[PDB]
Write an enzyme that holds these catalytic residues in place. Structure first.
Site, PDB file in Angstrom:
ATOM      1  N   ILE A  33      26.366  69.389  98.186  1.00 46.34           N
ATOM      2  CA  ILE A  33      24.939  69.557  97.972  1.00 46.34           C
ATOM      3  C   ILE A  33      24.471  70.876  98.604  1.00 46.34           C
ATOM      4  CG2 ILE A  33      22.737  68.374  98.075  1.00 46.34           C
ATOM      5  CD1 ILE A  33      25.333  66.421  99.567  1.00 46.34           C
ATOM      6  N   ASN A  34      23.692  71.646  97.850  1.00 48.82           N
ATOM      7  CA  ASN A  34      23.007  72.825  98.380  1.00 48.82           C
ATOM      8  C   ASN A  34      23.913  74.029  98.529  1.00 48.82           C
ATOM      9  OD1 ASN A  34      20.246  71.847  98.892  1.00 48.82           O
ATOM     10  ND2 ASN A  34      21.270  70.449 100.331  1.00 48.82           N
ATOM     11  N   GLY A  35      25.217  73.802  98.434  1.00 49.89           N
ATOM     12  CA  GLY A  35      26.154  74.856  98.760  1.00 49.89           C
ATOM     13  C   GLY A  35      27.484  74.735  98.063  1.00 49.89           C
ATOM     14  N   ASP A 142      25.255  60.053 101.862  1.00 55.15           N
ATOM     15  CA  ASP A 142      26.093  60.427 100.729  1.00 55.15           C
ATOM     16  C   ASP A 142      27.576  60.360 101.130  1.00 55.15           C
ATOM     17  OD1 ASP A 142      26.042  61.237  97.984  1.00 55.15           O
ATOM     18  OD2 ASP A 142      26.894  63.151  98.617  1.00 55.15           O
TER      19      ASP A 142
END
Ligand SMILES: C[C@H]1CNC(=O)c2[nH]c3ccc(C(=O)Nc4nc(C(=O)NCCN(C)C)cs4)cc3c21
Length: 291
Positions: A33-35, A142
């Site tokens: 996530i995000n990266g 997660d």
């Protein structure tokens, strides 16, 4: 008489270009996530590392912080450094982490074979990650098999929990835990994901799957909501009905009925992993054939 070892150091963020300290290859090790996680190299020791690229903002800032705290745990992937740089003028945080070469939990299981007692020992280690987190009031939220990589491909390589993108914070003597900080029900859906991974550990498929032309509640999502699943043979034929009863207490539909990470760890099948049936398990051949 004082907890000296309980003082850990808080994060010091390096602000020079990370390309002083590392060569940064264009090659991706994974996605989170995000990266995206690129692979980099220390320019001095030539040693090999993982780089995640977040872009600054309270989400990014929050992942670095929460994760830095969980970095102490042996079972959570170790942060090496965090850089705050200017990436083409827009400002972003860079997490440098250790490398994990053993592959995903399941991939490093999908070739041999795997037995209950071995899954119990594996479920314990994930539980330690999760039990450390909740004891410092962080919920990961997660925890899936893809967030679990082994350090090396050695038989003595550790299992480590990656990715704090979705991770979130959860805040006399006979006072009750309610008063001492309401705490939502977030640690809860780590406990659920623990069951899902316990279930997929033993047979080789997930409890909830995709099938529509049936009788009651087809939706992949309705089976989740209802809590509609169970343990088919042969896959489960000889599997401890103690263990199944444990998987019944994490896969509860109701978050308040689930088992706390402490109850989980004290529970026998985990706690005494070294005295459970060493009996065979379909995983390796199940998980291999399917794919
Ligand atoms: C997971 C991804 C998900 N989210 C995260 O935050 C995250 N943090 C990580 C830290 C280290 C590694 C790591 O050690 N990755 C490695 N990957 C390989 C590798 O061989 N990749 C091959 C994949 N490519 C061919 C598609 C060797 S080491 C992966 C991470 C991830």
């Amino acid at each position: 008489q004082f907890p000296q070892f309980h003082v850990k150091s808080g994060l010091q963020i390096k602000k020079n270009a990370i390309i002083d300290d590392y060569k940064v290859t264009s090659q991706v090790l994974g996605l989170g996530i995000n990266g995206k996680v690129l692979q980099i190299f220390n320019k001095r020791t030539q040693e090999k590392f993982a780089l995640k690229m977040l872009q600054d903002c309270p989400k990014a800032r929050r992942e670095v912080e929460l994760h830095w705290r969980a970095s102490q745990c042996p079972h959570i992937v170790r942060i090496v450094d965090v850089y705050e740089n200017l990436y083409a003028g827009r400002k972003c945080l860079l997490i440098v982490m250790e490398c994990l070469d053993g592959g995903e939990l399941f991939s490093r299981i999908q070739d041999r074979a795997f037995t209950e007692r071995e899954a119990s020992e594996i479920m314990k280690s994930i539980g330690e990650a999760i039990q450390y987190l909740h004891s410092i009031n962080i919920a990961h939220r997660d925890v899936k098999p893809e967030n679990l990589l082994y350090t090396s491909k050695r038989p003595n390589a550790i299992l480590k929990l990656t990715d704090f993108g979705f991770a979130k914070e959860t805040t006399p003597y006979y006072v009750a835990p309610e008063v001492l900080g309401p705490e939502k029900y977030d640690k809860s859906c780590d406990m659920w994901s623990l069951g899902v991974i316990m279930y997929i550990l033993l047979c080789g498929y997930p409890p909830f799957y995709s099938n529509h032309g049936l009788a009651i509640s087809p939706g992949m999502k309705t089976r989740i909501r209802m809590g509609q699943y169970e343990f088919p043979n042969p896959e489960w034929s000889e599997v401890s009905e103690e263990v199944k009863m444990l998987i019944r207490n994490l896969l509860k539909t109701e978050p308040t009925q689930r088992m706390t990470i402490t109850e989980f760890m004290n529970h026998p099948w985990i706690m005494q992993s070294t005295k459970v049936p060493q009996t065979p398990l379909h995983t390796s051949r199940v998980l291999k054939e399917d794919k």
